[PDB]
Symmetry: D2
Subunit: 121 residues, 4 copies
């Protein structure tokens, strides 16, 4: 609950998601940063029966950075939680892995953090 | 290509995945570690047109740790790449976020790394 | 340059550091969160000849969470960069590893992100 | 205890460290990968009174990638634990931050994992 809809991160990226009744996330992602253009498919999962003690709702999703316009040979996963209320948020940390040869595998993965809100910066 | 099927990590967990023609990952995950029992739904994405220079194929997927037997109020995302050949591998790093109150949010996310192979340890 | 002094993160923790001329960081850390009390020794390194193109200055430091009052059998490393100017910042991501047995090693490491400023929240 | 000496990771890098009696780590690092040449100064911290229940000993250290031969405008922190015994190990995860402009800050940090042993691969 509260997850379905449009979310914006601190970079200005747009996350459009539908949370299905038994834990599915499905939607599109449009990144304001990096080797990206237009919308990309996403899919993920969320806890559809979270705790009732004030804790957030755990979730995650993946984008592979290939669409009809661009292929960046990479994929990002966001892991985080939804925190409801008047200033609802999805707080995440992410891992972006790029395809790499063996010699470059050590340097294949970026890490960061995105904060999503219902009204953009 | 090469991704569909069963994979095993260094903990003995079992990852069963179908890679669809236009980038979908769908399947089940059974963890040998942590607050888990039996299979959980997963979904993710992969680069369906990887580079041809020897690089791996970028991918990611998510498990929310709720099924009919157990809810651990948490979700893991694996970000990594498939590397084909006689000793094929999926090399990943992962983020596990647990639902948390505001006071505990700083401590909500574990990080680690899993190596998947087609024949178990 | 610009690094020496007192910094505060979003949790209210206090980072007191001296940046030595050839790349040393030395000081104390006081955490507002977790299994911590009073000051802990830190040491780290920074790039003492950063780029002049507007890029930040790369750095990192470590705290082991043992002092005369408390031992949390753990250590945090912060990796990030100093960004100078009127609203100077040290932007970091961190890894906290706790001592663990073999069975619990997979769950030994937390990840997060701290933003330090010269005037507290 | 057991930490002082020379360690080798899976890339063939050489970590030479002295663990001082009250928690200091001091030494040199020579990387077999990336924008590195010869030895770099490191400093870090470790838990000098670990648990006695079979748990490892938490530690961390930092290298800034500047020496007399090369400056890669970046720093790596390793966070992990020492596990003693006949096949002693230091198991780590690391964060490498590169100096970045504001527009590139999102992409400033790599993550990975290194396993150190007392006899090289
Ligand atoms: O730029 C993209 C694709 C778009 C990513 C957008 C990112 S997702 C997390 C963050 N939040 C957003 O909203 N937007 C950004 N992909 C690159 C990254 C850099 N690459 C490498 C290669 C080798 N090693 C490391 C990195 C090459 C591929
Ligand atoms: O144990 C699980 C669910 C099963 C995870 C299994 C993990 S997935 C990555 C790794 N690879 C595998 O194959 N198996 C393991 N969930 C916990 C974790 C610890 N928890 C917290 C709470 C607060 N902060 C931090 C952590 C509570 C919830
Ligand atoms: O709480 C502390 C020591 C203080 C850490 C303070 C942290 S440093 C990053 C952040 N920024 C700050 O300013 N303050 C916080 N240590 C614990 C953590 C949880 N622990 C485990 C055990 C097993 N697996 C995972 C985690 C047990 C030991
Ligand atoms: O290559 C180095 C310095 C040597 C690092 C060696 C690494 S330490 C962890 C691992 N374990 C080892 O033993 N060896 C390797 N530095 C780069 C990295 C890539 N860079 C960027 C820039 C912008 N964003 C992301 C990354 C530019 C600077």
């Amino acid at each position: 609950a509260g997850i379905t809809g449009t979310w914006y991160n601190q970079l200005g990226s747009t996350f459009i998601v539908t949370a299905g009744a038994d834990g599915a996330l499905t939607g599109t992602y449009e990144s304001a940063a990096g080797k990206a253009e237009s919308r990309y498919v996403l899919t993920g999962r969320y806890d559809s029966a979270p705790a009732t003690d004030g804790s957030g709702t755990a979730l995650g999703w993946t984008v592979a950075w290939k669409n009809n316009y661009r292929n960046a040979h990479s994929a990002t996963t966001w892991s985080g939680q939804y925190v409801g209320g008047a200033e609802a948020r999805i707080n995440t940390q992410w891992l972006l892995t790029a395809g790499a040869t063996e010699a470059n595998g050590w340097a294949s993965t970026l890490v960061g953090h995105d904060t999503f809100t219902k009204v953009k910066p």
